[PDB]
Amino acid sequence: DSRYTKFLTQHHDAKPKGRDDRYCERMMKRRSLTSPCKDVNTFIHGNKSNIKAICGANGSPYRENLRMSKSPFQVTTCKHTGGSPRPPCQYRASAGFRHVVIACENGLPVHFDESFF
């Protein structure tokens, strides 16, 4: 697989071990996002319940089909460097406490809008 399961696999790490370049390199490999190297990928920290609530009362409609969180989240964005689609995949991290924009379907998060950052 469902789009919700895919979203958790790609975008949720509750208690990150770090929030730097090496953290991104290790996590992109662990979540199988390195064949080919994914260009940009954000991990959202904290609990799952707060992320699901964006699809209800803790989010607001944003543009035609997206939703913006009403409060900020701890996030780490991983951006591919070197430009080779082939692994090993090197990444640069950008961590922050930011509002996030997602898409929801059936009350569940199914896509992360990387372009918002």
Query: DSSP code of 54?
Result: G
Dump the DSSP string for 68-87. Answer: EESS-EEEEEEEEES--SSS
Q: Provide the CATH number for the domain formed by 1-117 in this structure.
A: 3.10.130.10
Dihedral sign computed on CA atoms, order 91, 97, 103, 106: positive
Q: Per the structure block, which two tokens stand in for 108?
A: 């569940």
Just list the catalytic residues.
11, 111
20 labelled ligand-binding: yes
In the chain, domain spans: 1-117
Instruction: Return the number of other C-beta atoms located less than 10 Å from residue 85's C-beta.
Output: 13
Experiment used for this model: X-ray
Q: Is 75 annotated as a binding residue?
A: no
Produce one character per residue of 19-52: b if its CB has 16 or more CB atoms within 10 Å, e if not: bebebbbebbeebebbeebbeebbbbbeeeeebb
- 3-class DSSP assignment, residue 109: strand
